[PDB]
Design a binder for these strands. Sequence first.
RNA 1: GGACCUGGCGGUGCUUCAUCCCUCUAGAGGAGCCUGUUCUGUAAUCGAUAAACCCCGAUCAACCUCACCACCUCUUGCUCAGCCUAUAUACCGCCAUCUUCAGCAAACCCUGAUGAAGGCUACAAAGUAAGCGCAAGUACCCACGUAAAGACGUUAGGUCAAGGUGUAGCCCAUGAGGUGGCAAGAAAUGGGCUACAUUUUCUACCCCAGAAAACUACGAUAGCCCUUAUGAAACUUAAGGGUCGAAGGUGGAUUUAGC
Lengths: 195, 343, 304, 132, 150
Amino acid sequence: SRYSPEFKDPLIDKEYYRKPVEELTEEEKYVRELKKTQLIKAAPAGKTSSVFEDPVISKFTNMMMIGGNKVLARSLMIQTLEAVKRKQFEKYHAASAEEQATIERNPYTIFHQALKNCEPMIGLQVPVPLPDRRRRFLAMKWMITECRDKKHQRTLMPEKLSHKLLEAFHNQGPVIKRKHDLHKMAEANRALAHY
Amino acid sequence: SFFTKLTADELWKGALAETGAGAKKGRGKRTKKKKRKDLNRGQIIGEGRYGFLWPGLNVPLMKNGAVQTIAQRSKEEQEKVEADMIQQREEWDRKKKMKVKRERGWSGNSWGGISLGPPDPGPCGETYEDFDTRILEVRNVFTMTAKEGRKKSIRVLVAVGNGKGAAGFSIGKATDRMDAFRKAKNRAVHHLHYIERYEDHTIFHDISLRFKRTHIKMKKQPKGYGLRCHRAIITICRLIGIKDMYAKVSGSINMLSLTQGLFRGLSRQETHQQLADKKGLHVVEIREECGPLPIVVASPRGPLRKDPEPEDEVPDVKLDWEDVKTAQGMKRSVWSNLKRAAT
Amino acid sequence: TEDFIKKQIEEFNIGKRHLANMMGEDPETFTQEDIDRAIAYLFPSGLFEKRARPVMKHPEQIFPRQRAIQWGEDGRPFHYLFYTGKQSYYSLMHDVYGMLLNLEKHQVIGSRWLIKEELEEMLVEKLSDLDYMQFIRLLEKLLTSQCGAAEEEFVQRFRRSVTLEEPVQYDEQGMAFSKSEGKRKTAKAEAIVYKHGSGRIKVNGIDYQLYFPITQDREQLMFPFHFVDRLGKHDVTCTVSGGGRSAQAGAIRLAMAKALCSFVTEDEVEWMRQAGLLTTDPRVRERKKPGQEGARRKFTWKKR
Amino acid sequence: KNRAARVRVSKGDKPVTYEEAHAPHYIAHRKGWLSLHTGNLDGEDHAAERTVEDVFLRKFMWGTFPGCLADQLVLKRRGNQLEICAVVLRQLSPHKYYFLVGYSETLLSYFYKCPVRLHLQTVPSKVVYKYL
Amino acid sequence: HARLRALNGLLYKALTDLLCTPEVSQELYDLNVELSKVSLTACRAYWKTTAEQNAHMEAVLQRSAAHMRHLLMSQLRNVPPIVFVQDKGNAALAELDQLLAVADFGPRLCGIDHEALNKQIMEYKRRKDGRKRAKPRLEQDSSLKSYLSG
RNA sequence: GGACCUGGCGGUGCUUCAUCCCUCUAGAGGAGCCUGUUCUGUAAUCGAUAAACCCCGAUCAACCUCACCACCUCUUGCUCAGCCUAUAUACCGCCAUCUUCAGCAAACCCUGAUGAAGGCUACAAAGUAAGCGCAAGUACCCACGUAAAGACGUUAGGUCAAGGUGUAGCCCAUGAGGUGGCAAGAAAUGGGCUACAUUUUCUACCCCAGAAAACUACGAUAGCCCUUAUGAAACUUAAGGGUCGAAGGUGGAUUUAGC
Ligand SMILES: [Mg+2]
């Protein structure tokens, strides 16, 4: 890497820098004094301080990216969010007053809940626990691979991804089925956990 | 093509094949071989086939006080010059071929006994022209290394002595024999013993010592007896400066063990002066050739004892069966007292 | 030898006088810098190694400071720790230990420790890694102890400064502004941020929303001002050239951040630096190597 | 193993000059070029002719001063001038050196149709930068 | 290595003695924990595991680790920190079973490449249609001959 | 035969490692084509050819190049001749490989009783002043990174066809010149390109568009035909247009590359 090891990763969080000095611990004070003397890497073109920035969505878009086409991946992601929001709004308007309380219209909340549902707690052969990062990566990769499946013909990526995300938000869909299959396989191979 | 030609050094490097795997291994026998020659040994600048005489280059610039002109030698004299050059080259080659032989060691194909000249001079006025170096053994030790397997090395045992009682020996390990010689002699010159000699020609008393598995029995001998000892002992004694001595070596004849046991025994011997100082008595020498005349060879430097040494009728000493058998004449041997060359 | 060094010093003095004559300057005031400049002019050399270029320095510098033999005519060595073979290092250690003993008797930011090569040059003596570590430990124990001014000076002989790394102008109409520059990949940008404004950015004379159709580039532009909560309060005129859309956006972002540093508070400047808005990005395209598909990809190792 | 223009260490006794010691990757780093001419610059021409001339000059000078040369030549070109700077051992009598200088200058001037100067610097022996 | 082995044995013995005596702690004495292994690099301790009681034992050991280190410093005074490792047989199995209970499942020949050889034979059909080793110690050397020659 | 030393080896112990395995991305292995090799064929080169051959010598073959073949011709010949004739297992020259290494070799010193051998402990116990390499320095944009560098040694590694050269061989021919000619696929295999599309295709634009979207789709840089460029010579080479719309539908073990 062109950055020397002395360089440290930047910390983009306005609350961290606007935090009052009094609330800082002695350890935090020492951390700030140390950072005052540390070389810091340039902020990557991906993340900013925008209140609308979502690291989960940014990582999902990067995973969707094919051949460095960040523009197209971001377009697909925003189209998917718009499709989810429009479908939820249609359901909200078509529903009665009681059901309107239950219907969720936030695309970001829907996306996060769907990915959380798709996260497999167990993995594999000998079944083994999975760390949090591996769980999130598996959920995202399963969603993307399922949406990229040839089983859906002539349907654009935004529509397929919105449909799968809504299925996952209701604990259904082929991604949740894949998670359940992995869980069942791990349960079956539990007898080999002594290895 | 002119531009395709090379220099003499490159051509010799290519043709002689001094480097490469062939030189390292030698699988291809090279009895029919090429050797380097100096093509510019006798060439004079300005000499060629046309036999031209260029003033200032190959002929004197000014002749009889006047500048010479461009002149060309006649065909006859140019032919004579070329023939003379050929003959001079042949004479140079003949002088290169001639050489001078040396003196063999104990045997015609053994390094033992071959002299190596004086040790190399020291850094600061520390020279050893008085010292002579002699090889006692050369061995080709083969060591098994992880990569190269059997690797050859030379272990050489040398002894150096000035002929005046100061001598030593050393071992030298190397890849080349000459490096081993240099190391061994330059190290032996730093490990010099001093062998006290009775009358500067023999040992002070009879010695019998065992080093490891080698028994050395040396006998003090009168002048003119010569050196009747193992050839290695003869060499070491010549280096020390002992002219008359007898020595029988029994047990293992390991050259290194024999050499260092010999040096130990010679160094540990006690002089007549030391004996007189120890026992506080006159050391009186009795010679058959001098009749009953008592010759005092050493007197104690301190007080002289008044009480005579007790004269036991039967001494308590460990005799040698070989010596007793020889004295009684029963030591019949077809190899003892054989006439041999001068030592 | 010492006499050789004396002869070299005399030759250097004569040559210094001759060079001063050649350059037509006063020999009495011809400094070493003048000597170096004159030598560089008279003997130009484009060799990259500065140590390979012609040099006519003082013999004290040209010759190694290992000096001649460390003993006089009588052979007695000058230094009492000579037989240690490392008289400089062990003398230094002895002095440091004496300082520590005296400290016992009586009772970080802009500097680093010189590397082992620097210490070897200081003492003109070869040293081992463990020797250097032992000396560094002793020095750091000296520093941690209640070192006085003399001990601080002693340490400063080994302290090496760490390599840690804005104007305000007025236009013809009295509009206070700041100007800065930035680079990113191949794109180079120059930005002008005015002290008072209403959030209008003109890139190459074109509004940013019409010059940067991609939302990512506009987010990059928003990043500096949004970090300091000054969105819509400053006017920016910036010109970028070279590279692609993202490289230009990054260059403009860096230039804008550097220019805006002239208006925000020093604590805000430190916060911007810690956020990475001020560090020039060294990530640039890596050259393709011969025998390889790209910068790092090798050719497909043929099937066997 | 790279072999170009390198003098491989054999025993630690073979002497090499400054140029022989340095490997090709040190050119323009620790050693300059042995020939200076505007042929290889941007946009300039006749590089091949200058290269052929330099090769022939080096061969001719090496064969004209047998064993006298103590180092490689330096071929400088200024306009149509041609300066051959050489370092020569002090073997021959200076009469032969002067004869060879006049000869080589005149012959090369008539052969390349340019004023050729030959500058000789004599050394007592081949300068030894290090031993290999 | 052997010295480190003896040090590990001594640490094991000291920890066992501290466990057995009641003077260290009434809680620890009542637990009656037994150590399977003690190994020094920090020190790793491995004790046999009997779930609720296992968790209680682990918690008490973690609470009393500092006091155990302090008591060990009285003896071997320079004792590195002691790490207690619960030996649930294969701990992976125990953790996996715990997660599996927690987790959700939702609704319920000849040894050769005969083909390659057959292809090669079809291809062929279509195309149709010791010595002495001298001992190392006996090799001659002519260096002495050269030296005597001149 | 006894004891020991060094190495090799152990279905040898222990400890710690790496891309060795898993994890990540994109590929290869399926299709067509380009090219290379191999085989066959032909009157018709050579060399490389396990990693370290296989878009390799070539940064390049229609004639030339060319060293191949057939036929014809010349004999002091372009050369104070010549040979691309044999030998890389005689070599120089230039490199591959470990090396994505850190050690190597001299010169000493010391230990083992002066045996083969051995020579490390940093709160240090016999190793070491120099040389080579790493390192340092330098190039590129930094101090990072990438280049470059990378010793000794290993594979008689590659090249006698870059050139030079040892030895051996040819001299009315194994030399020199001219005309004409190969170069095909029944195939196998290596690498690459283009694809099998919807994150796609076409157009505009260079990222706020409109259409296409399975038998008139996606998909040839292939075939066929006709021009054009270069050339003395083009169905041979290249470019362009027309025509054709083929195989193929994300491909098994296995395998490549990346931080
Ligand atoms: Mg004989």
